[model samples]
Target: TTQVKHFETLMPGYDSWIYIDLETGKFEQQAELGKREFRKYKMMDPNYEVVGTEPAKGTDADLPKKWDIAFHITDARTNNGEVLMTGETDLNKINALPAGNYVADAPADIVVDMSRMQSEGVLGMVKTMLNGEMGKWVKSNGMGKPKTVMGNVFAVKFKNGNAALIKFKDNLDKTGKKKAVSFDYKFIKKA
Candidate 1:
């Protein structure tokens, strides 16, 4: 007879799932392992609304200027069943805006330059930065305990001073996991 150990293994281990929109034949959610603890919600809607803004307090009030920026990471799926990553930036507040009027007339500041960045160039830069620049920067800057699976990103800034969306094809793993990927982009100035 087989002897059963006193210790027991955890049951009903975490299961990874992604939301799918049947009508569109697309995926509505992106999930990653190890980071799931922090992602408590089932899904996040790809939209934002101005909550409110308040005057800067204490040292913030003493500063000459203050701005509020919001960053969001979104996941999308393609017709071929591949997953993609997208980022959006929002200027929630500008100087002299009341609570609900956080929306400003000024354009978003974030940018990603791609005209000078060819596929070969990006691959070479990513390799060098991952193995060289990033490693040195982390060590010299006293970044505690670096991990191999750290997320790395490279971007370009445009001259016209407008924010652009960057889109890229997805890279998949043997087990069909979507990696941090890149896409083509077009600039759209806010009215």
Candidate 2:
């Protein structure tokens, strides 16, 4: 006789299922197979939760004076009569910004390196940094955490530079549960 059990797994999406067993020591389910949570996106799903500047806040400007220089925030907008893109996440959103008069969120103390940002972009930055000088040095003599700068990132300064948006990542899972369903960027860029 097979003994059965009820399961109400409160994961994210699915629920209400059954857990059955043969009642023998050789067969059991819910115990051996509990909630199987897996990431969905195979790479950095282009999802961005944008808080644009009217000016806005959180960008490279907020970084420390002695930190690694990263990308640049070409532009940002707000709901103050000049609302840009609201609830629309586009990768090239912040690319074309019309310079206008608005309240500054923060000072542009640490300017983004336009040369590097436009040229190499996200992939180039990762490849160059991971396999270039830093990687080489670590390989040669062995350095921090497996001699790989695992935490290295090159991103565009958000708004005032307090935070940054580092796009792109190995986005998904073994089965297929996705992530980064970010709202539309403040203003996704157009070609």
Candidate 3:
């Protein structure tokens, strides 16, 4: 139902934070995992190739012109967008943009010269906003419950002034390539 692709974006040498557009879709999906279908899309560009584990410098030429969010294994990455954790599991409760810090994340494989926790930057903060998994929940950061893998709801703000309430259903099936992952999503605003 989903396909995974590998690609990389080169970072500018400037100081401001730069994000990669690994997600591709128009948010035309309206499906869920339990009661409906989880709409799947081929987000990342497959044309980019790598020599061994090193990616080509300019492979990002074909990156999506407009994509909001994407996944790599368990890490969530964004395009020209930012995400905020609402600390709520119920999706219906989220209707408006709640005031909080939103973040655009760096790629999962990127290694910054500075020292930090495994999930410590923007993505890490979002994941732990529900409170640190102090017990058995530690395995999934308080996610991965019995019925819902990503039982929490997150707020998404795209670069084009569109907002969304995304509820991830589950991680994509593990039978395909590991370069990317797909999850269930829904849009709260229009383009």
Candidate 4:
């Protein structure tokens, strides 16, 4: 069985704010374009600890006292390639800060669909092509053991697959061997 956690509601507009109603279990505001809300709640337990408020002091402070709250649903990903991760404070609960300004930072979320690539056989093709070539070098260089040779090869191939070959000749009399060798390789992609 999953254990449940309880949180308390602190007075808003002080130093911290609770955006969602704990009892109602609903959003304070309707969803809008390019905007989202975070549900804040104070964790109530002996092991739980309270951190300091955001602003800490002065008239600009939203919550003068620090309170604990469970941050809920602040991140989202849309089917239209829109990703949003925001630290949004509720304006209704906090009186000090102006609307739209309470959000500290907003970052775009990244979503990589591995299954989609695998379904198209891209994963197998990449693995086969990479493991067949550079896999030999990585095993000999002591970069990794045989078990991880494929992964190492993939990394090397990904990095060096876009460069042109460079060939240099050394002084023949200085070395035991011929001393002339190709130092680079060309990588080509077909259209």
Candidate 5:
């Protein structure tokens, strides 16, 4: 007997990256367009363009078997697909899935060629596309303090043997630009 369901989701700051599916929470947003002109042409050329999702507005093909969690303000942050550095800013003494090392087991995604993108150019290809080439989670490295990450609390263990929890409500709205970003979730299913 377990059911903890509360919902809230919005993400679209500077571009987009909100691919979630913790057992049907349903999400799809992937454009990542030019992140402020790749930060004012910091040298550009990380493939120039071609970020995905948002075509027919569906068919991530269950995003690597029923997507888990992914949110972006620029840092990439993910769970249940591993990308470490899980942020837990003690959001009201935690709610669940708390015990550190939130178990990411075996997840992968990191293959940059073209001679390793010319040996990691353009700030290492923006940290290898914020650790996401469909490698299932990795984008949360450095900078987060009102830099549009509002109250972080991430955790998940999905990949069939479910278990979930996430909190990152609102990033920027009210005409401040860098829009969308609202989250609060919980879903645990395993027999």
Candidate 6:
């Protein structure tokens, strides 16, 4: 048996503008929810013909939001050229992660920074490409949602290692190493 889901990507990641139509993954850009704007670029390539949208939801989960480039990052990070951003970021200390590969938590060598994209840049791109709960979520950052700095889908660099992209789903609005209750890591593989 298969369960159907209603949603489509309209922003960056979890913060994307998801179209809430289960049977069809199609989305409308002009739908209104209130006295606000809605929009974003297609975060990733999406399947308009995709069946049952629920399967596409999850951590490191890839669903097209306004839009994104699905091409795997080829920049080398470590593991003697065996590990890279491979489009995932998980935590592991047992192995020596190299220069640019992704990690769930900052790996001492770099940090994730999604600020420029958060409501000011790319994330703000959703300002007109989305609506509904998705619009509400985006507006939450400015309207009344707690001021959080997680789950924003970040970018990595070995230089600064202080910037980050934060998402607030798993913690009930709590942040930092002390308050988070559980954790879900992104995809990572040895190249």
After superposition on all C-alphas, the RMSD of every candidate to the true structure, in Å, is 24.5, 24.6, 15.6, 28.6, 15.1, 19.8
Q: Give a tens-digit lDDT track for model 3, residues 100-163.
A: 8776654223221112223322111111111111111113444334222556666777777766
User: What residue runs in model 5 are displaced by over 4 Å at the alpha carbon?
Assistant: 1-77, 82-157, 163-169, 173-181
Full-model lDDT for every candidate: 0.21, 0.21, 0.38, 0.20, 0.46, 0.24
lDDT: worst 10-residue window of model 4: 122-131
Candidates 3 and 5: which is better by TM-score?
3
TM-score of candidate 5 against the unseen true structure: 0.26
Residues 3-74, candidate 4: write the lDDT tens digits.
Answer: 221222222221122332222323232211221212122332223222211221223133213211112121
Evaluated at residue 49, the lDDT of candidate 6 is 27
Clashes by residue pair, model 5: 10-181, 76-139, 77-139
Best of the two (1, 4) by TM-score? 1
Q: How do the residues 1-191 of candidate 6 rate in per-residue lDDT, one tens digit apiece?
A: 01212222222222222231112334322211212222232433421221111121233223334221111110111211121232223332212333453433212111112343446332211111211111111223564344342333223222222222111143232333231212222222223
At residue 120, give the lDDT of candidate 1: 20
Which residue runs does candidate 1 get wrong by more than 4 Å? 1-161, 171-175, 186-191
**Alpha carbon lDDT of residue 60, candidate 4?**
18
Deviation of model 3 at 101, angstroms: 1.9
Name the best candidate (by lDDT).
5
Writing each residue's lDDT as its tens digit, candidate 2 over 1-191 gives: 11221211112212111121111112111111121222222235543232221222234243333321111111111111121212213334333333333232221222222232234332111001111111111122243222211222212222332222122222123243431111111222222
Using TM-score as the measure, the top candidate is 3
Q: Lowest-scoring 10 consecutive residues by lDDT in candidate 5?
A: 33-42
Candidate scoring better on lDDT of 2 and 6? 6
Instruction: List candidate 3 segments past 4 Å from native.
Output: 1-57, 107-148, 172-184
